[PDB]
Write a protein that binds this ligand. Structure first.
Ligand SMILES: CCCCCCCCCC(=O)O[C@H](COC(=O)CCCCCCCC)COP(=O)(O)OC[C@@H](O)CO
Ligand SMILES: CCCCCCCCCC(=O)O[C@H](COC(=O)CCCCCCCC)COP(=O)(O)OC[C@@H](O)CO
Ligand SMILES: CC(C)CCC[C@@H](C)[C@H]1CC[C@H]2[C@@H]3CC=C4C[C@@H](O)CC[C@]4(C)[C@H]3CC[C@]12C
Ligand SMILES: CC(C)CCC[C@@H](C)[C@H]1CC[C@H]2[C@@H]3CC=C4C[C@@H](O)CC[C@]4(C)[C@H]3CC[C@]12C
Ligand SMILES: CC(C)CCC[C@@H](C)[C@H]1CC[C@H]2[C@@H]3CC=C4C[C@@H](O)CC[C@]4(C)[C@H]3CC[C@]12C
Ligand SMILES: CC(C)CCC[C@@H](C)[C@H]1CC[C@H]2[C@@H]3CC=C4C[C@@H](O)CC[C@]4(C)[C@H]3CC[C@]12C
Ligand SMILES: CC(C)CCC[C@@H](C)[C@H]1CC[C@H]2[C@@H]3CC=C4C[C@@H](O)CC[C@]4(C)[C@H]3CC[C@]12C
Ligand SMILES: CC(C)CCC[C@@H](C)[C@H]1CC[C@H]2[C@@H]3CC=C4C[C@@H](O)CC[C@]4(C)[C@H]3CC[C@]12C
Ligand SMILES: CC(C)CCC[C@@H](C)[C@H]1CC[C@H]2[C@@H]3CC=C4C[C@@H](O)CC[C@]4(C)[C@H]3CC[C@]12C
Ligand SMILES: CC(C)CCC[C@@H](C)[C@H]1CC[C@H]2[C@@H]3CC=C4C[C@@H](O)CC[C@]4(C)[C@H]3CC[C@]12C
Ligand SMILES: CC(C)CCC[C@@H](C)[C@H]1CC[C@H]2[C@@H]3CC=C4C[C@@H](O)CC[C@]4(C)[C@H]3CC[C@]12C
Ligand SMILES: CC(C)CCC[C@@H](C)[C@H]1CC[C@H]2[C@@H]3CC=C4C[C@@H](O)CC[C@]4(C)[C@H]3CC[C@]12C
Ligand SMILES: CC(C)CCC[C@@H](C)[C@H]1CC[C@H]2[C@@H]3CC=C4C[C@@H](O)CC[C@]4(C)[C@H]3CC[C@]12C
Ligand SMILES: CC(C)CCC[C@@H](C)[C@H]1CC[C@H]2[C@@H]3CC=C4C[C@@H](O)CC[C@]4(C)[C@H]3CC[C@]12C
Ligand SMILES: CC(C)CCC[C@@H](C)[C@H]1CC[C@H]2[C@@H]3CC=C4C[C@@H](O)CC[C@]4(C)[C@H]3CC[C@]12C
Ligand SMILES: CC(C)CCC[C@@H](C)[C@H]1CC[C@H]2[C@@H]3CC=C4C[C@@H](O)CC[C@]4(C)[C@H]3CC[C@]12C
Ligand SMILES: CC(C)CCC[C@@H](C)[C@H]1CC[C@H]2[C@@H]3CC=C4C[C@@H](O)CC[C@]4(C)[C@H]3CC[C@]12C
Ligand SMILES: CC(C)CCC[C@@H](C)[C@H]1CC[C@H]2[C@@H]3CC=C4C[C@@H](O)CC[C@]4(C)[C@H]3CC[C@]12C
Ligand SMILES: CCN(CC)C(=O)[C@]1(c2ccccc2)C[C@@H]1CN
Ligand SMILES: CCN(CC)C(=O)[C@]1(c2ccccc2)C[C@@H]1CN
Lengths: 557, 557
């Protein structure tokens, strides 16, 4: 009785990651120096894996962990992606709480991020080109220009980060953000407690509104005084950055964040698709729009960065932060220039709130669907189970609504789904292409969509995707950089705590294999066969008909 | 198929609480000023409630949460005591780790707590009366004399508390204590994974060894140079302290810690007693020995405190700490005076290790039995469930093995089982004496032990016990004192965090009643009846035969 389900694909393409995460990853890794790795990972890994995750859930009709009946030893990969989805939900909800606070603050004729006369603002808060306040001048620049009305509003007005000295002194949860976080978790609860398709209104709003706003920002941005300089930066490619490995790791993780692969969302979502649904069309369409949305997102962001650098008399590289709060500074700065700013402020933060809600809904659905498919008891107690998932997320999100929650969020955004998600998607590709068989997988898609995937897809699923995923995983560990939020440098123990979060999900795969073998009764050969054979044909193990014990299985594409 | 089970009662009487917690509670609340409240709470509340908890588990054959089939609305009381048992297990295991470290350090001809020439020792570490090192003299005293070899060894040698400034800067888990904690959780796992009576050797050792060592310490202590002054302090009663409420709250919580009532241990343990077992004899015997053990424990401790004050030229009130590490300073100081100290050091810490292991085993059994009786699935997966309980305890015990884990332990020892345990035992007494009926309870004991409890027990169970429990609960909240470890005063937020821990268990009772009523289907009257009627006669609810809807039920003793 599984609840099987134009604007659908376009809404799926837009995500809090494409509108909030991509901009700062692009800004940090240079404008076009990030596009080259991003497009490569999308075509050789992102799009291929998106098609695999869609087909895996649409053929087995299962969530992230229960699709591993095809190869039992790999259920730890399903538990790992569900843990990653939970970790990301903690700080995703905090981004929605910021949008809710910004929305509530937008209902004023005078927006709070336009001038420096407020209580939160520090003496060091220069009004761009004396826009509102005309005092002194710009005679000094800063590594990160946090002395702008919009920056000061985000840092002091909303986060109260000025009250935290680091991840060692996070402080107490901010009450205004605690109220916003509670509204977010209440909306999330009543959007998931009665099922998966229970919530459709947010999906509809997050299908056209995001594109419309991006278009308005893009058209207005290109006409801003110094937008051209930003456009030039976006177009220029820094080849030296390509030699460095950071851009490649950032691009790969962003691909899985922007597409949703490696969180269990795609498999859980496709578990309710019709068996005949064309995953290939959906993969191509979503990936193509994601590439366009990401490109136009960076163009708009760099146009605003160009104007901001012109208005603040700073260099584009030093005009804004490269953290998770860049869109809460750049977009507010752009809305102010738009006539009828109050209207645009409300419309923009309504879009951010809506986009974040679906993003959090999909992640929590992956956790709920994944665990409910594993334990049918949780399927009959959804309202109670949803409460547990939402409440746990709210409590652990309380760490990021603290005066130093940006430091905790930077840590989570870097380790909750970095090497861990690349390792999980690598294990899934290896599990389906080598242990299960790309040939069997292709026959599965031939049964579902009526055609066997082309050699390009088969080669990517078995060799190209895994090889590139293995390279970025190894490079992530070999060339790991100490975590830093802007000027602040994290204490060494925070990096170890971050690696502990990363390993937490990664260790589930080895631990499950140990558990599966120990829990199995038989000879070492028999136990190994039971762990690699489809759980629908374990009788073949009794008859000694193991395809994985034949060299042709590993020689089949 | 429940696994139904002289030295037994004597071993049950001795506990880490009687040998480790009582001494510092007695020292903090004066010698005999604590005995008066302690003896009162034991006779009017402790012993009466011990008999109720023993009979409740021996008649219903259930753990802390599943015994509430008699009155359904109260299962939150069972969940509350299981949560308290888990909270206490976190820092109980850390006390066992200290005993393991002290045991490993005792295998030397020269004990580490006898002199101040070691690396851990600070310049301020005076050898008592220049015992080992003869330099300078005693010309200044201190609020807490932490400049003694034994004190410095505990604080700097073992805890490394000198590396933490407070609960704000706990630091990293000490690796030597991390190794000791891992051995403790491994021993606990293999003592619980295969059942309840799986471990009997520790029970046998902790039946005579504790008494023997206490006797040796008592006989040697009374002969120590300044022991008389300590004896005089123990005998003297400070009436002004009796007027204060702290001694009463401390005495009441110690009674439930020393007897095991309010952690779910007594009910779970009695669930495996034979139906004919005489709870009354066991209650009288255990309570009588607990009163004697506690009295002689304080006599030995105050005799060592008297000698230490004489040797350190300090006042007994300022000679030692009043925290959870008093026995790791006083007993080491006494062992040193005993000829063949190395032998006595090993024997003493072997006793502490053994006593702690059973204490932790009983608490974890309450959590495992309580949850396994609730969920029969956990009964079939004991080795896996035990792992989860032990592993979770180990991870949360990692907070107390940190350089500032004594601060976390002080917080847990004050809030994990303080007002919360008094509230839980109050709710259990109210639930069985008023909602279920002391008359019904007495008929249950008449069926089990062949006699109806006397009016004294019935009056205590319905009026005396609850009234005194209600008084200490209200007094605990009305006259709460800010937490302080020795000189250190906790930051105000730590007190709120502590009250959050206390309320966590306490809120389970209200939350369960809300859940039970909402989960029940029927009229408000019908739902209320279903929540107060024995779950074996819910047909009476259909026939409108509710004893609790008759005034005589609340007028019956
Ligand atoms: C750092 C943790 C180290 C031990 C943590 C993991 C140990 C043992 C799990 C394990 O391996 O057992 C799995 C079930 O796993 C779960 O529940 C989810 C719990 C995973 C824990 C999340 C960790 C959070 C930091 C049982 O899998 P299964 O036997 O295939 O389940 C089948 C059954 O559900 C329905 O047939
Ligand atoms: C600060 C938490 C606020 C919500 C936390 C509590 C909510 C809802 C529990 C609740 O009320 O449901 C109970 C089962 O409760 C449990 O599991 C233990 C879990 C308790 C959570 C420990 C809290 C740790 C800080 C279900 O009780 P039941 O319906 O009588 O169970 C019968 C079934 O087990 C076998 O028939
Ligand atoms: C299994 C689930 C519960 C794991 C939860 C993971 C997250 C929420 C945990 C794991 C490690 C944690 C961090 C460990 C240590 C510190 C330093 C302290 O000074 C502030 C909190 C902070 C920064 C913690 C924030 C929350 C944290 C990131
Ligand atoms: C078991 C899991 C799901 C939930 C446990 C997480 C709870 C206990 C955590 C999450 C966030 C935490 C809070 C985060 C920050 C602070 C500020 C600090 O100055 C005092 C403690 C306080 C107020 C913490 C109390 C404990 C807390 C609420
Ligand atoms: C611990 C879990 C289970 C639930 C409780 C969450 C706690 C940590 C949360 C919930 C309510 C919060 C408080 C709400 C409002 C205020 C007032 C102001 O001074 C800011 C801090 C303070 C005091 C918050 C501190 C953190 C807080 C106490
Ligand atoms: C904001 C954070 C701190 C807490 C969130 C708690 C939420 C999830 C809780 C608190 C009150 C709860 C509601 C209380 C009562 C009912 C009526 C019942 O027949 C269906 C569920 C429902 C509607 C509950 C759903 C979950 C609920 C909304
Ligand atoms: C726990 C903290 C956050 C308090 C939350 C208060 C609010 C958000 C909660 C408390 C009780 C809740 C209500 C309880 C019962 C119902 C009936 C249900 O069929 C629909 C939702 C509705 C109408 C809930 C809406 C949300 C609600 C009003
Ligand atoms: C068929 C029956 C036995 C199903 C049993 C349900 C079990 C397997 C499910 C239901 C509730 C779940 C737990 C709920 C909450 C937590 C705490 C979290 O920090 C780690 C995961 C953990 C520990 C979950 C593990 C999986 C779980 C234990
Ligand atoms: C946020 C932290 C502190 C608490 C989280 C509590 C969550 C994980 C707990 C509390 C109540 C629990 C539920 C209580 C009862 C049942 C019914 C049972 O047949 C299946 C499991 C299920 C549905 C439990 C799943 C786990 C659960 C939802
Ligand atoms: C620090 C820890 C997490 C390291 C990893 C420990 C893992 C591998 C351990 C912890 C507890 C173990 C389980 C405990 C009990 C059983 C039941 C037994 O009949 C088969 C093996 C099985 C199912 C074990 C499998 C391996 C296991 C899951
Ligand atoms: C449901 C279970 C997991 C609850 C766990 C309760 C215990 C282990 C938790 C709850 C609140 C916690 C404390 C909250 C805040 C601080 C201050 C920080 O600077 C050091 C850790 C310290 C002192 C925490 C230690 C661990 C703690 C006491
Ligand atoms: C879900 C429950 C059962 C387990 C979660 C508790 C874990 C995540 C907690 C318990 C104790 C914690 C540690 C306690 C103290 C420190 C020192 C600090 O300077 C860095 C973080 C570090 C090293 C913590 C890391 C996270 C930690 C290991
Ligand atoms: C997080 C949970 C799931 C498991 C991991 C526990 C972590 C917090 C524990 C386990 C091993 C511990 C480390 C073991 C030994 C050392 C070396 C020395 O410098 C002291 C600190 C340090 C570095 C410890 C810090 C805390 C630590 C990292
Ligand atoms: C010390 C802390 C950090 C971790 C403790 C982990 C313990 C509980 C784990 C680690 C290794 C585990 C063992 C590994 C394998 C087996 C064999 C299996 O057929 C029965 C269970 C048994 C014997 C496991 C019991 C639980 C176990 C001992
Ligand atoms: C996880 C960390 C603490 C490592 C723990 C290592 C030690 C304590 C563990 C690892 C593997 C374990 C062994 C694995 C399997 C068995 C067979 C079982 O029938 C009895 C216990 C025994 C013999 C275990 C004893 C404890 C053990 C040796
Ligand atoms: C009959 C079937 C459905 C039984 C289901 C088992 C459920 C009810 C049991 C088994 C595992 C348990 C969970 C294991 C671990 C945790 C995490 C802890 O922080 C809070 C309690 C919590 C959340 C437990 C609640 C009760 C639990 C969810
Ligand atoms: C210490 C923290 C980080 C992790 C704790 C994990 C614990 C609570 C989890 C991990 C593995 C879990 C078990 C995995 C599978 C089963 C079998 C199922 O039929 C009943 C529940 C049971 C027995 C789960 C109970 C909860 C469990 C023991
Ligand atoms: C902050 C939180 C812990 C406050 C307390 C919330 C409690 C009272 C709420 C949270 C979730 C709620 C449950 C959610 C869903 C259901 C299923 C519904 O058909 C009957 C009520 C029931 C079983 C609710 C009972 C009340 C409940 C347990
Ligand atoms: C963007 C919306 N879409 C595409 C149709 C989704 O699939 C998800 C979703 C679908 C329905 C309801 C809630 C969430 C939200 C996931 C994304 N993480
Ligand atoms: C002191 C020993 N006794 C008395 C017989 C106990 O009941 C417990 C126990 C019994 C058997 C095995 C383990 C633990 C340990 C509890 C105490 N908290």
């Amino acid at each position: 009785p599984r609840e099987t389900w134009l604007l659908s694909v376009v809404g799926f393409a837009v995500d809090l990651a494409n509108v909030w995460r991509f901009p700062y990853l692009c800004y940090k890794n240079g404008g076009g120096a990030f596009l080259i790795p991003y497009t490569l990972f999308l075509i050789i890994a992102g799009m291929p894996l998106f098609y695999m995750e869609l087909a895996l859930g649409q053929y087995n009709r299962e969530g992230a962990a229960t699709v591993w009946k095809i190869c039992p030893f790999f259920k730890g990969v399903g538990y790992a992606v569900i843990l990653i989805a939970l970790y990301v939900g903690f700080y995703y909800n905090v981004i929605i709480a910021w949008s809710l606070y910004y929305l509530f603050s937008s209902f004023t004729l005078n927006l709070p991020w336009t001038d420096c006369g407020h209580t939160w603002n520090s003496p060091n808060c220069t009004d761009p080109k004396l826009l509102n306040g005309s005092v002194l001048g710009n005679h000094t620049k800063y590594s990160k220009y946090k002395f702008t009305p919009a920056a000061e509003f985000y840092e002091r007005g909303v986060l109260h980060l000025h009250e935290s000295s680091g991840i060692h002194d996070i402080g107490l949860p901010q009450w205004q953000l605690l109220l916003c976080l509670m509204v977010v978790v209440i909306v999330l609860y009543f959007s998931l407690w009665k099922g998966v398709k229970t919530s459709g209104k947010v999906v509809w709003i997050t299908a056209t509104l995001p594109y419309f706003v991006l278009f308005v920002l893009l058209v207005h941005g290109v006409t801003l005084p110094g937008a051209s300089n930003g456009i030039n930066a976006y177009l220029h490619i820094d080849f030296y950055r390509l030699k460095e490995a950071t851009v490649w790791i950032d691009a790969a993780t962003q691909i899985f964040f922007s597409l949703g692969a490696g969180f269990g969302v795609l498999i859980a979502f496709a578990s309710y698709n019709k068996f005949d649904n064309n995953c290939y069309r959906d993969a191509l369409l979503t990936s193509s729009i994601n590439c366009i949305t990401s490109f136009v997102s960076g163009f708009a962001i760099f146009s605003i960065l160009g104007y901001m650098a012109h208005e603040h008399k700073v260099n584009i590289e030093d005009v804004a932060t490269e953290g998770a709060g860049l869109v809460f500074i750049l977009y507010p700065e752009a809305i102010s220039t738009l006539s009828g700013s109050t209207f645009w402020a409300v419309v923009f933060f309504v879009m951010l709130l809506a986009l974040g809600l679906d993003s959090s809904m999909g992640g929590m659905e992956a956790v709920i669907t994944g665990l409910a498919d594993d334990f049918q008891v949780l399927k009959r107690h959804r309202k109670l189970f949803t409460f547990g998932v939402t409440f746990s997320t709210f409590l652990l999100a309380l760490f990021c609504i603290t005066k130093g929650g940006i430091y905790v969020l930077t840590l989570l955004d870097t380790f909750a789904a970095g090497t861990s998600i690349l390792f999980a998607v690598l294990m899934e590709a290896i599990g389906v292409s080598w242990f299960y068989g790309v040939d069997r997988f292709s026959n599965d898609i031939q049964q579902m969509m009526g055609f066997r995937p082309g050699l390009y897809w088969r080669l990517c699923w078995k060799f190209v995707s895994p090889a590139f995923l293995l390279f970025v995983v190894v490079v992530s560990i070999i060339n790991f950089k100490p975590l830093t939020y802007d000027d602040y440098i994290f204490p060494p123990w925070a990096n170890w705590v971050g690696w502990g979060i990363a390993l937490s999900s990664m260790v589930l795969v080895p631990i499950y294999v140990i558990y599966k073998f120990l829990s199995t009764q038989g000879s070492l050969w028999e136990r190994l066969a039971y762990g690699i054979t489809p759980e629908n044909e374990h009788h073949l193990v009794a008859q000694r008909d193991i395809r994985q014990f034949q060299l042709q299985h590993w020689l089949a594409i």
